[PDB]
Amino acid sequence: GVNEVPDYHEDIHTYLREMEVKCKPKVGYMKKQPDITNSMRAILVDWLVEVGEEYKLQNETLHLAVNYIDRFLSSMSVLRGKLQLVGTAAMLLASKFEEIYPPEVAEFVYITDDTYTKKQVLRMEHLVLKVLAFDLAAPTINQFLTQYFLHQQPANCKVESLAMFLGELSLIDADPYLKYLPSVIAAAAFHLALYTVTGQSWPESLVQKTGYTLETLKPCLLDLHQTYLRAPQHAQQSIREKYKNSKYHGVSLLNPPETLNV
Amino acid sequence: PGSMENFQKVEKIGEGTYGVVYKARNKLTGEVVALKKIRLDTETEGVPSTAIREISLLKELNHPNIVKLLDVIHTENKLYLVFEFLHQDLKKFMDASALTGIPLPLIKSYLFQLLQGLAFCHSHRVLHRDLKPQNLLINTEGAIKLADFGLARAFGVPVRTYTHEVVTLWYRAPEILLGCKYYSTAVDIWSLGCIFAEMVTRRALFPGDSEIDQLFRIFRTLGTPDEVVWPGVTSMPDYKPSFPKWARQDFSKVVPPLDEDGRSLLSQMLHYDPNKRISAKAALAHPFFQDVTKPVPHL
Ligand SMILES: Brc1ccnc2ncccc12
Ligand SMILES: Brc1ccnc2ncccc12
Ligand SMILES: Brc1ccnc2ncccc12
């Protein structure tokens, strides 16, 4: 019914596909950042995961914030001492965009341990808005995932939660997920989730919707599959901790499959 | 791309939440614009979420039936939204079109354009969520455009739970009034439905003074809904069995001057069940519009 917008779902999907290309960060920006690294970004993203858990924020908000961070770091050189200020302003903006009840600015100041002032946070908010030119309605992995979900026959909450988890893991590591579009990571995540839980594969019906096959997703899948296998050892662990919760059907406790068989 | 030194203020023309709207003139190009000032010096939480949604969503919606945001002047204590100027809103026009009434060609033209604008919104994952005549701007050429996207929201598919009790009450869809967990594009259609009726009668179709009075006014016109007309209704969070059960009056009594085609379209806009309620896209093909044109306003 109308909650799945049947008269507009195609138009929307087509429009997000176009917009994900426009809202895309530069794949090679870390090497051009003098003072920050993939590892510093991973620490930041893993922290924003924890911030969303503490403030009971939508998963969509987290994804928006990272989109904003990556786009910002694509044109703006940032000292490591200021990396977190950017991420805080990013999470505030995402929250004001996406959440019914965003946390107050004071709360954002508080989660930074008074590293930064309220004045610093509000000034970085204006800068990110200037650098992004207010282009905040960015497609996220989640917006694709939720549409992919409508193709499940039948629907499996473990499939859905496990896809959310995997897509979320991908936020942590610019190498190699900066090279892949939201829509392609969501497709890898959905297939990997479906295969893990039920043994089934990317459906004919999503080939029709997306144009993606297992042929075209294979690069992101091989990466995502490694990230899943290695996730217990990753230095960042907030996402796994998060997906132990029953809210997400404890999907981080499922065993990854050893092999994908193409 | 712009600066306030090339604008000349002319007169106040309105008010939003974050301040006044001003008519101004670009001194280099001649263009007439509306300036919406958003207070930031007074803002202790930074840029308002209303403004962030308004600006981000409007930069993407380039359509002839959506008010065009031309520019954003980001000073340090001030934020100025530059829109194309339109002369009047639909509410002012309806009040000045009394005694004569709005001519059907123009009602039909305006409704048609409104549907084009809303459909374009819905096609770009955008709910307007405050459609009412005060927020629909008309020009001297015959255009009408959706405006005030301050309560608007980017939706995902399927929708999740968004802010409750949105839409000015007289225009709020029943599924919001019943506190449903999820609402979708159909809430905007409901608003246009009310507006359609309103253009014909020049008075609001459901002028309630409370959420419950609003429901009861709706029920007394469309009949109290049950599981047959609207499966789920008796389960909705704020459905109550004690609701009086009113008969659906014949729909030709709701808006007597309306013709067969108009009635058909209005009934489909005010269907209880958000799943059966017509979409903006489908409504464009309805025979009501078989002879539609774009005439200038008569006044
Ligand atoms: Br067939 C076809 C084409 C485009 N999109 C589609 N989405 C879902 C199911 C089938 C589709
Ligand atoms: Br014209 C115009 C554009 C934007 N907002 C407006 N608010 C009030 C009156 C006219 C407006
Ligand atoms: Br525009 C237009 C032109 C001709 N016939 C039409 N029928 C229905 C809706 C719009 C129409």
Domains, chain B, in order of start with CATH, read 4-87 (3.30.200.20), 88-298 (1.10.510.10)
Distance, CA of A228 to CA of A224 (rounded, Å): 6
B175 in a labelled binding site: no
* Residues B189 and B277: beta-carbon distance below 8 Å: yes
Q: Which residues pair with B22 in a beta bridge?
A: B12, B35
* Residues B294 and B109: beta-carbon distance below 8 Å: yes
- Residue intervals of chain A classified under CATH 1.10.472.10 are 11-24+138-262, 25-137
CA of A11 to the centre of ligand 1 (A): 11
Distance, CA of B280 to CA of B121 (rounded, Å): 10
Secondary structure of residue A160 in the 3-state scheme: helix
Secondary structure of residue A48 in the 3-state scheme: helix
Distance, CA of A100 to CA of B90 (rounded, Å): 30
Query: Which residues have C-beta within 8 Å of that of residue B259, sequence separation ≥ 6?
Result: none
> How many contacts, defined by CB atoms under 8 Å, are there between A and B?
107
| Structure token pair of residue B88 | 């009047």
Q: Hey, what amino acid is at A164?
A: M
* Residues A239 and A252: beta-carbon distance below 8 Å: yes
Q: Where are the extended beta strands (E) located within chain B?
A: 7-15, 20-26, 32-39, 69-74, 78-84, 88-89, 126-127, 136-138, 144-146, 153-154
Distance, CA of A34 to CA of B291 (rounded, Å): 65
Q: Is B77 left (phi over 0), alpha (psi -120 to 50) or beta?
A: alpha
Lining ligand 2 with CB less than 6 A are: B 13-14, 21, 34, 36, 67, 83, 85-86, 137, 147
- Most distant pair of Cα atoms in chain B: their distance: 65
Q: Is the dihedral of CA A93, A95, A101, A106 positive or negative?
A: negative
Indicate which ligand has the atom closest to the C-alpha of B265. Answer: 3
* Residues B138 and B174: beta-carbon distance below 8 Å: no
**Fold for domain A25-137?**
Cyclin A; domain 1 (1.10.472)
Distance, CA of A213 to CA of B136 (rounded, Å): 45
CA of B56 to the centre of ligand 2 (A): 18
Method: X-ray
CA dihedral B62, A127, A56, A145 (to 10 degrees): 40
Q: Hey, what amino acid is at A146?
A: T
| Structure token pair of residue A251 | 């999907």
B85 in a labelled binding site: yes
Distance, CA of B124 to CA of B103 (rounded, Å): 32
Closest CA to A16 of A176, A161, A186, A150: A186
Q: Hey, what amino acid is at A33?
A: Q
B13 in a labelled binding site: yes
CA dihedral B63, B68, B70, B71 (to 10 degrees): -110
Distances in Å between the Cα of B297 and the Cα atoms of A260, B87, B197, B216 are 65, 11, 18, 35
Strands B32-39 and B78-84: antiparallel
DSSP element (H, E) containing A223: helix A214-230
Closest CA to B188 of B117, B287, B110: B117
CA of B119 to the centre of ligand 3 (A): 16
DSSP state of B77: S
Find the helix packing angle between A83-98 and B49-60, rounded to 10°: 80
Place of tokens 């997906």: A243
Distance, CA of A68 to CA of A73 (rounded, Å): 9
Q: Using most ligand atoms within 8 A of CB, pick from A9, A147, A207, A208 the residue to mutate for ligand 1.
A: A208
Distance, CA of A28 to CA of A75 (rounded, Å): 11
* Residues A23 and A139: beta-carbon distance below 8 Å: yes
Radius of gyration of chain B (CA): 20
Query: Which residues have C-beta within 8 Å of that of residue B116, sequence separation ≥ 6?
Result: B63, B64, B65, B280, B284
Closest CA to B138 of B85, B200, B188: B85
| Sheet of B20-26, strands arranged across | B7-15, B20-26, B32-39, B78-84, B69-74
Of B72, B76, B124, the CB nearest to A134: B72
Closest CA to B155 of B131, B130, B123, B179: B123
Q: Which residues pair with B115 in a beta bridge?
A: none
Distance, CA of A27 to CA of A39 (rounded, Å): 15
| Structure token pair of residue B224 | 């109290």
Distance, CA of A222 to CA of A260 (rounded, Å): 9
Place of tokens 């999503």: A206
Domain A11-24+138-262 has CATH 3.40.47.10: no
Closest CA to B90 of B65, B125, B64, B68: B65
The residue annotated as part of the active site, out of B130, B259, B261, B273, is: B130
* Residues B187 and B127: beta-carbon distance below 8 Å: yes
| Structure token pair of residue A53 | 């858990």
Q: Hey, what amino acid is at A212?
A: Y
Q: Enter the resolution in angstroms.
A: 2.4
* Residues B63 and B74: beta-carbon distance below 8 Å: no
Q: Hey, what amino acid is at B296?
A: V
Q: Hey, what amino acid is at A58?
A: Q
Closest CA to A201 of A211, A213, A185: A213
Residue nearest atom 3 in ligand 3 by C-alpha distance: B290
Is there an atom of ligand 3 within 6 Å of B77 CB? no
| Structure token pair of residue A237 | 């662990």
Q: Which residues pair with B109 in a beta bridge?
A: none
Distance, CA of A4 to CA of B109 (rounded, Å): 30
Distance, CA of A257 to CA of A197 (rounded, Å): 9
Distance, CA of B78 to CA of B69 (rounded, Å): 17
| Structure token pair of residue B260 | 């067969």
Question: Any idea how long chain B is?
Answer: 299
Q: Which residues pair with A242 in a beta bridge?
A: none
Closest CA to A116 of A141, A87, A144, A156: A87
